[PDB]
Design a protein around this ligand. Structure first.
Ligand SMILES: NC(=O)c1ccc[n+]([C@@H]2O[C@H](COP(=O)(O)O)[C@@H](O)[C@H]2O)c1
Ligand SMILES: [Mg+2]
Ligand SMILES: [Mg+2]
Length: 361
């Protein structure tokens, strides 16, 4: 799993994120050399680490993004503890370890004049021919900066592996037979967005059990099962920058506190914590209890009638996890906004920046 050929090229980047600018250059470099070593640099709290893409995560995403290439290897250049001399020691250590042959024609592709200048001073006498080539990376670096500043605006250019991280997430929460499913569908269809289904609905249909028949192990199953489903939408190739999620672990954790014995709830507690902590939410739409009884079709037999009891615990728990600043309650139909959906789609506009057409003048 090392790089073959004589003419090999070295390409640098912080890749925060990798985008079609880098890629278009990287593939050009691959057509001119027998092989290419991508070198990701980073240090704690760097520009990428401050948006949640530390060097390690960026390196793994790169390996995944180029898992397909016979002649492209991804390598890590750890710039912690730096003083150019030791930096170059590591860089040529990378080259030596990740190459197969001797008598190489190595071409560095560098974008800053300081780097090329300090690199030319330090070619070691190891049988290789070294050249440093300058590249105008202004447009690539500006693009990566624009992407971090507003990912939704430059979404199509973000490499798909990195899109996993930059997605806005809207989660709809509320007791059943309150309209969530109609709401999630219409919100997501408004902006050509993907959406998830309430997993408890699908679990209860596939396993043919009612709300009162759920035991602890069923809740356990619904936690990881709803998360997988939401994670599947977050990472969908249909995602354009915003996804909508029909409930999450908090919802399930509200039902579980309300209906499980204390001991059985105490036992799901670690899985609840781990799952809820892994949930990135940007906007939380809460549908409050109302005397409506929507019933899109399927009836949660028991998760009705005590809607206020559910809504109080739900708000209790949303506070417990410090999420209230992301929360918007759709308290309409007797409050203002025209409909529950008008309020919601406008909140989607406030929190994600997407344009929404008005119906009237
Ligand atoms: N289920 C959810 O609400 C939710 C929200 C955000 C991310 N995720 C998942 O967790 C991961 C987040 O990765 P980062 O650590 O890069 O943010 C993603 O791969 C995604 O699939 C899940
Ligand atoms: Mg991924
Ligand atoms: Mg508690």
């Amino acid at each position: 799993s090392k790089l073959s050929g004589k003419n090999i090229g070295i390409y640098f980047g912080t890749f925060a994120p990798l985008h079609t600018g880098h890629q278009q250059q990287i593939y050009k470099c691959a057509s001119l050399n027998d092989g290419v070593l991508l070198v990701v640099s980073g240090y704690d709290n760097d520009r990428g680490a401050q948006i949640g893409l530390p060097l390690e995560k960026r390196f793994r995403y790169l390996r995944e993004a180029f898992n397909d290439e016979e002649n492209i290897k991804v390598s890590m250049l750890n710039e912690n503890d730096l003083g150019w001399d030791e930096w170059a020691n590591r860089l040529f250590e990378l080259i030596h370890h990740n190459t197969l042959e001797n008598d190489l024609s190595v071409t560095f592709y560098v974008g800053e004049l300081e780097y090329a200048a300090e690199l030319k001073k330090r070619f070691p006498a190891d049988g290789n021919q070294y050249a440093v080539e300058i590249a105008d990376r202004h447009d690539i670096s500006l693009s990566a900066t624009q992407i971090r500043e507003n990912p939704q605006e430059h979404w199509t250019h973000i490499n798909r592996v990195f899109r996993r991280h930059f997605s806005k997430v809207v989660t709809v929460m509320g007791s059943a037979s309150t309209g969530k499913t109609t709401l999630v569908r219409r919100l997501a269809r408004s902006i050509n967005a993907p959406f998830s289904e309430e997993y408890a609905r699908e679990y209860e249909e596939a396993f043919n059990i009612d709300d009162d028949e759920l035991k602890m192990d069923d809740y356990a199953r619904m936690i990881t099962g709803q998360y997988d489903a939401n994670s599947r939408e977050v990472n969908s190739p249909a995602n354009q920058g915003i996804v909508f999620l029909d409930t999450d672990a908090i919802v399930t954790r509200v039902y579980a506190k309300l209906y499980l014995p204390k001991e059985d709830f105490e036992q799901l507690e670690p899985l609840f914590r781990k799952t809820i902590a892994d949930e990135r939410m940007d906007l939380i739409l809460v549908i409050p209890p109302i005397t409506e009884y929507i019933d899109d079709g399927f009836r949660h037999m028991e998760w009705e009638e005590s809607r206020h009891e559910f809504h109080e615990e739900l708000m209790r728990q949303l506070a417990e996890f410090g999420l209230l600043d992301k929360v918007v309650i759709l308290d309409d139909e007797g409050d203002g906004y025209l409909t529950r959906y008008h309020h919601a789609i406008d909140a989607v506009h406030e929190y994600t920046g997407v344009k929404i057409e008005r119906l009237s003048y």
